[PDB]
Design an enzyme around this catalytic site. Sequence first.
Site, PDB file in Angstrom:
ATOM      1  N   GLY A 119       0.695  -1.232   0.247  1.00 55.18           N
ATOM      2  CA  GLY A 119       0.213   0.243   0.250  1.00 55.18           C
ATOM      3  C   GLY A 119       0.720   0.729  -0.249  1.00 55.18           C
TER       4      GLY A 119
ATOM      5  N   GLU B 226      11.217 -10.730  25.232  1.00 54.55           N
ATOM      6  CA  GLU B 226      11.182 -11.742  25.080  1.00 54.55           C
ATOM      7  C   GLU B 226      10.548 -12.697  23.932  1.00 54.55           C
ATOM      8  OE1 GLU B 226       9.439 -13.745  29.168  1.00 54.55           O
ATOM      9  OE2 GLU B 226       9.086 -15.118  27.300  1.00 54.55           O
TER      10      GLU B 226
HETATM   11  N1  LIG Z   1      -4.642 -10.143   3.904  1.00 50.28           N
HETATM   12  C1  LIG Z   1      -5.397  -8.516   3.356  1.00 50.28           C
HETATM   13  N2  LIG Z   1      -4.657  -7.828   2.693  1.00 50.28           N
HETATM   14  C2  LIG Z   1      -5.074  -6.314   2.318  1.00 50.28           C
HETATM   15  C3  LIG Z   1      -6.142  -6.230   2.890  1.00 50.28           C
HETATM   16  N3  LIG Z   1      -6.532  -4.565   2.436  1.00 50.28           N
HETATM   17  C4  LIG Z   1      -5.322  -4.627   1.298  1.00 50.28           C
HETATM   18  N4  LIG Z   1      -4.578  -6.251   1.133  1.00 50.28           N
HETATM   19  C5  LIG Z   1      -3.545  -5.963   0.600  1.00 50.28           C
HETATM   20  O1  LIG Z   1      -2.628  -4.451   0.989  1.00 50.28           O
HETATM   21  C6  LIG Z   1      -2.252  -4.551  -0.544  1.00 50.28           C
HETATM   22  C7  LIG Z   1      -2.459  -3.302  -1.532  1.00 50.28           C
HETATM   23  O2  LIG Z   1      -2.519  -2.651  -0.016  1.00 50.28           O
HETATM   24  P1  LIG Z   1      -3.474  -1.265   0.994  1.00 50.28           P
HETATM   25  O3  LIG Z   1      -3.925  -1.422   2.536  1.00 50.28           O
HETATM   26  O4  LIG Z   1      -4.971  -0.972  -0.181  1.00 50.28           O
HETATM   27  O5  LIG Z   1      -3.153  -0.279   0.033  1.00 50.28           O
HETATM   28  P2  LIG Z   1      -3.180   1.558   1.674  1.00 50.28           P
HETATM   29  O6  LIG Z   1      -2.184   1.053   2.689  1.00 50.28           O
HETATM   30  O7  LIG Z   1      -4.642   1.924   1.746  1.00 50.28           O
HETATM   31  O8  LIG Z   1      -2.616   2.264   0.582  1.00 50.28           O
HETATM   32  P3  LIG Z   1      -3.036   3.356  -0.081  1.00 50.28           P
HETATM   33  O9  LIG Z   1      -2.481   3.283  -1.720  1.00 50.28           O
HETATM   34  O10 LIG Z   1      -3.048   5.080  -0.284  1.00 50.28           O
HETATM   35  O11 LIG Z   1      -4.986   3.530   0.081  1.00 50.28           O
HETATM   36  C8  LIG Z   1      -2.823  -5.130  -1.752  1.00 50.28           C
HETATM   37  O12 LIG Z   1      -1.823  -6.060  -1.955  1.00 50.28           O
HETATM   38  C9  LIG Z   1      -3.608  -5.929  -0.603  1.00 50.28           C
HETATM   39  O13 LIG Z   1      -3.431  -7.537  -0.891  1.00 50.28           O
HETATM   40  C10 LIG Z   1      -7.514  -6.877   3.518  1.00 50.28           C
HETATM   41  O14 LIG Z   1      -8.074  -7.035   4.474  1.00 50.28           O
HETATM   42  N5  LIG Z   1      -6.492  -8.302   4.355  1.00 50.28           N
END
Ligand SMILES: Nc1nc2c(ncn2[C@@H]2O[C@H](COP(=O)(O)OP(=O)(O)OP(=O)(O)O)[C@@H](O)[C@H]2O)c(=O)[nH]1
Lengths: 438, 54, 429, 339
Positions: A143, A254
């Site tokens: 992200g 730990e």
């Molecule tokens: N396991 C899991 N992965 C997630 C989830 N939501 C997003 N991802 C993963 O996170 C990656 C994208 O990250 P995001 O968390 O959507 O990005 P962000 O932090 O919102 O950053 P922005 O681009 O600013 O919205 C992708 O590879 C997704 O597979 C979730 O709820 N569960």
Amino acid sequence: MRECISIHVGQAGVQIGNACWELYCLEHGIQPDGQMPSDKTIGGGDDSFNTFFSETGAGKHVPRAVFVDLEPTVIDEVRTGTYRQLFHPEQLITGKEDAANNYARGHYTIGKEIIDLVLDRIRKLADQCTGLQGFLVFHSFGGGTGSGFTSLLMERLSVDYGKKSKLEFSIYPAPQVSTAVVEPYNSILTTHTTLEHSDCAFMVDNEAIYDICRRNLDIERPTYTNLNRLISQIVSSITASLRFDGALNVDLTEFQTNLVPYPRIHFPLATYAPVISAEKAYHEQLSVAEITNACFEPANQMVKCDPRHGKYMACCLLYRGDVVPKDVNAAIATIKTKRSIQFVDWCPTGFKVGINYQPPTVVPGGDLAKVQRAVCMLSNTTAIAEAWARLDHKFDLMYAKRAFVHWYVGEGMEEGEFSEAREDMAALEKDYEEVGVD
Amino acid sequence: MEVIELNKCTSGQSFEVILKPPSDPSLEEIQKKLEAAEERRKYQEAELLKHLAE
Amino acid sequence: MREIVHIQAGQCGNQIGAKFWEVISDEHGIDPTGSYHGDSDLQLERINVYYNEATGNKYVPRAILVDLEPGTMDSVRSGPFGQIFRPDNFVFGQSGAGNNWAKGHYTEGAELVDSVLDVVRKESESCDCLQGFQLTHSLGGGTGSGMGTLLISKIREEYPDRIMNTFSVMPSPKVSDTVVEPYNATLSVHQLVENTDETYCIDNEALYDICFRTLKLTTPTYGDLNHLVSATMSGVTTCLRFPGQLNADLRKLAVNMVPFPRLHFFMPGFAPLTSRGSQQYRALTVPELTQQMFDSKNMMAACDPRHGRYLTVAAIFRGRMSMKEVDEQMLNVQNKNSSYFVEWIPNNVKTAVCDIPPRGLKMSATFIGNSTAIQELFKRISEQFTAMFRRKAFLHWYTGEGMDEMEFTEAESNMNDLVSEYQQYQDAT
Amino acid sequence: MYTFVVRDENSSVYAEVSRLLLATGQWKRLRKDNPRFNLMLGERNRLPFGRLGHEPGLVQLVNYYRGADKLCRKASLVKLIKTSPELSESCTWFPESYVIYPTDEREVFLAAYNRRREGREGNVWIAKSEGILISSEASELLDFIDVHVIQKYLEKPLLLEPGHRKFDIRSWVLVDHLYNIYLYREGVLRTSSEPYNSANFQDKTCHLTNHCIQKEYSKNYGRYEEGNEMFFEEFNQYLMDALNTTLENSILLQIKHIIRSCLMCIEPAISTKHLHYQSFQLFGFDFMVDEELKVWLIEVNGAPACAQKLYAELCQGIVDVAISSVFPLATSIFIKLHH
Ligand SMILES: Nc1nc2c(ncn2[C@@H]2O[C@H](COP(=O)(O)OP(=O)(O)OP(=O)(O)O)[C@@H](O)[C@H]2O)c(=O)[nH]1
Ligand SMILES: Nc1ncnc2c1ncn2[C@@H]1O[C@H](COP(=O)(O)OP(=O)(O)CP(=O)(O)O)[C@@H](O)[C@H]1O
Ligand SMILES: Nc1nc2c(ncn2[C@@H]2O[C@H](COP(=O)(O)OP(=O)(O)O)[C@@H](O)[C@H]2O)c(=O)[nH]1
Ligand SMILES: Cc1ccc(S(=O)(=O)Nc2cc(-c3ccc(C#N)s3)ccc2C)cc1
Ligand SMILES: [Ca+2]
Ligand SMILES: [Mg+2]
Ligand SMILES: [Mg+2]
Ligand SMILES: [Mg+2]
């Protein structure tokens, strides 16, 4: 008693945080309004769950959590979903304009405008702590917020709380469920900025959680909800020793003692067993031996790799449910002869074992079934380097052509950071290969 | 193969079993780097405004 | 990142624009009077991205309508959904633009552009968080081409950190108003390669062939072409107008589609292909949708994908269907034809699903390809340009408005550089 | 229609494998760096197992077993046989051998040499990594190596007639993704052309039977058998005519025992039964039959070259057994070693 503050960053952070806290509440008997009839000592306590909850005058239990996203949708679901009353509104922080999958937009551009507010809320939470241990930080590698703002936050936490341990829960990117093409960029970037600021990170390749939810939960296309429930099962297995009576892993320090001798190699491999469909009409309960054995099956790991072609540095087994030391030692004895478990010469071959008699708690209406006994193995093995290898490789493929680089420079970064992070990763890969391969 | 440091309580047990013995930046530095990226970014914006002026 | 400001410019610009506002008004349950009369709350959850909520709890399109003659705007206003639009947003001159880029960009259009920008501002200031702007126009005429590029330049100046998105209609001889369209198109491509984050290349030749060869329309009108364009515009903006898991916006689309900033010209695609007359009643299987949407005969920019390689792809499915069968078929497409995707951008095909099908279909697929084959289009134009310019034919119409032949040399040369770049990544590693 | 890449351009076997795959019209070949393949015919060094089987919607297979080097490098093979319990220290088919590093087991090699010279029975050894030197004196060996291996020399080998010459046996074994062990029925027998001399250890050619070395320093090469190679039909017919026995009874039983034991020993370490990518591999086992009709194991080669007659048949057998098994299309040549 010492307290642990949770921080959830970006979409994956906030959602996995939801899942975890819902689970914590079910396990600890805490209701969705914050009332814990179990708690006779109102307004406070020196108990183990107080590690993660603070108590109010009105006898309300509130997570030591902070949710921070540069975009309001997901934290608005938190603000309106089932666990409204649980959280203090000052703890749910949003911006208005996300980091467009761009690490540099989160770290520099948008981060600089919200880091001070995030650190003041985190300090308003630390200020209700007699002796703060440190931070659990949940984020994604791929992200824009999840990488950029997370590493800026880790920097600032090191400088404001230099003496507090910091643990990460990173979500490694998988193509089946990933959003963005530049996830390999962000990943590398943020790892390079966070490596010296994290004491122990627990990677979770989405690819693994996905195939587990396909094979074992019999889900056709898993969603984020399925992944997150399963991931919280794991996270609670890994954080139970902080919220319950016990002598194993009873403080954040730990974790780096039992799992991290070399500080650079701080990514343990989590292996969880048994994952059983709630829809299985008829299910035969697995023995201690069967679940301990499953711990050494790569199909059950949070990161697909092959520990048989690495060396182990530290192993911990965490049992929840009906288990006794005798059957653990029996299982181990058998498994050492039946498996391939090589340790580093400078480290004793053996297992630090933790048993909690309370069997795993499952969400009513989830996909996992209740079981009599389950286990989570944390093992610092070099085979996890595979996941960096892949990642580094994809990185090179794009950077070779400087593809998408201009999006990062546009936000103020310098191509030099790209190359410098990549070189850091190269060092890390080589360190793993020193410790492990012959 | 011996047990070590067995601890028992009502909530569970914990122990070790052994099989074989063996053979940061400042605040001013990060403020400076955030501000250097904001400068580069301002410079680029100014160049864009100059070219549009032309 | 919610509100988008729409702009339609010139004849073709306003005609596709008005069809697009019809198509999506119907998709959101807004009648021509401006009142919601649908069933699902899904039709209002993201209504703000394109509609202001006005007095009487009616909905008004966040759209500014620009021409240099009144004709097409008068006919839009007397049209089906004409009464939907805010009357203040009807900004027209009287002199017209003579299918002359110079008139639109330098002379006649400069009288009007400040007025258009005033209305733009009044519309942005009424937004919570403005994602960016989107323009529908042609590159062969004068108002659309010349003044649209003028507007783009001034909007970039006023809002330099916002997305600029266009639906641009490339001119073909098979569908041609005047002989000077290659001059207007080359000048506009120069501007667009400079000042646009995302341009959907819509070649009129392609729409003509699709209406003729495919839809079996023996003599196609501009309306038969605009139906295709409005359907495709609706399909690309689905991820924005409806609730999703992706929470997609313009900026992420530009970040993930545009590996290098000048290569932001996209091939759209629709599937299945539909005429106004025939309303065929055969639901498509997911393998069918994917084979069709990746078919060149379903692409609106008259390029051959097999004559190049895909830098990036974004696919949008609409309707009730198996997401497992989707992922299967989409991976099947990628692995059976891997030579046609670049190996230096891992997993460069991404997919979105919306549960709502468009009016008339139960299964829909819309395709957004950043392919190097697009160079073909730009070569085509450039050839047509030179065949005239080597003789300075028709240049007086432009020199009479103050333009110098140097501007033509530069614009052509910038487009040949664009072609070079596309070709360069078509053979990289 | 399946896809495969090829990341080792100098491999005879998998060259003929590529050819036969393409000729089925159901395999397409991709560029080496394309990840979207079904089958990798990968390189011999630093093969990227870390990247295999992470591509959704693609079942991936590879022609090398990760971890198999521990049977196929001379030092690691020796150490595996010594330490692994199933291959006892008293392993009766492995020549007693020790590992040496240039200036370890130096000490124990010397202890054994001396215990032997007391009985004063034959003490020739061979130094191994074409770099190999046989000698009866520890000092010449140790000055030659200054990682090598020192192996007891089988002083009394079976000698073919007419000619009075020694030989080694190459068998080819195919281990598929299910860990079935297939022994090719056509083994080869690489002989010395010029006769075995007990005391003249310095003529390389009398003792080393490497075909490489034969096509060069051999006075005559191809006199008795073409290319210095005797196939199983002639070897059997000779053994029947001369020693009144079968190849299958006096030799092949032990060969199948040794193959089965080595492979079932390393099986838990390398099996890809539950992994996210599968492996097959073609090994070449090098045996030596002493004059008592006892079989010995010299080395295992992980990349091996067949003989020019068997190429087509063995490579069709590989495509059938190791590849068409995973990727089906529109009297066998292998003996299944049962475990
Ligand atoms: N396991 C899991 N992965 C997630 C989830 N939501 C997003 N991802 C993963 O996170 C990656 C994208 O990250 P995001 O968390 O959507 O990005 P962000 O932090 O919102 O950053 P922005 O681009 O600013 O919205 C992708 O590879 C997704 O597979 C979730 O709820 N569960
Ligand atoms: N201890 C021993 N006793 C008898 N003969 C031996 C011997 N060691 C080697 N030899 C003979 O010498 C040759 C040994 O070469 P070796 O096979 O060890 O090298 P090599 O080139 O085959 C490595 P590779 O495993 O790749 O084939 C054999 O062909 C065998 O005839
Ligand atoms: N697809 C399509 N193209 C059009 C339409 N009207 C005009 N054009 C094309 O646009 C070009 C002329 O542009 P026009 O809009 O009249 O220019 P203006 O002076 O800017 O209004 C020619 O290539 C025409 O083919 C239309 O309704 N649909
Ligand atoms: C290769 C790759 C990677 C990531 C993405 S994405 O993050 O931009 N998601 C996404 C967005 C859209 C749209 C946004 C605005 C629209 C109108 N105008 S359509 C459409 C499809 C998809 C899959 C895209 C392409
Ligand atoms: Ca209490
Ligand atoms: Mg987000
Ligand atoms: Mg006109
Ligand atoms: Mg050999």
